[PDB]
Symmetry: C2
Subunit: 101 residues, 2 copies
């Protein structure tokens, strides 16, 4: 079972809403490449408010994601894309249902 997760809410700068949505959608292959990243979701709450939820078997998986390509790419573009600094929330998974793979 997946036991650990991360959640981040992301607010787009005026004029960078498409750019942020496209960035998040484009990261899917990067998430598929991360074997320790069990599940990964690019979220849209509203026209300028986006986010990511992802899930891991263990802390090694979670840290590998934070040290990985998607987190890197987001940090490299954050100042361009985002209107406020995002808080990456650590989450404990109390239970999870996923397809078996």
């Amino acid at each position: 079972m997946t036991k650990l997760a991360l959640f981040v809410r992301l607010e787009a700068k005026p004029g960078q809403e498409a750019a942020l949505a496209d960035f998040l959608a484009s990261a899917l292959p990067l998430a598929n490449a991360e074997s320790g990243t069990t599940a990964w979701f690019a979220l849209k709450f509203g026209p300028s408010t986006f986010g990511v939820f992802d899930a891991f078997a263990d802390e090694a998986g979670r840290q590998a994601h934070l040290n990985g390509q998607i987190a890197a790419a987001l940090m490299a573009n954050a100042a361009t894309l985002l209107s406020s600094p995002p808080n990456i929330e650590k989450v404990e998974l109390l239970a999870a249902k996923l397809p078996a793979g």
Copy 2:
């Protein structure tokens, strides 16, 4: 898969003294989620001492609505006053992209 497109992001605030009870409630709800054929992924969340949640994902509106009207929602509604300091905060979410294990 690109085929899961909708989600809910729910925050739940535990009543003081009820934090363990809410965590336990959520964990015991797993079999109920497992049985929901339209609920592709379902995660019971703990953010902090008294702050919990659910993130769940669906192929379509029918699956999302079946969850909102399902056994977990009913159980939480039956016990809401015992466990929660305010009503669930439920956000409808669109998925731009999603990785799940296959199946």
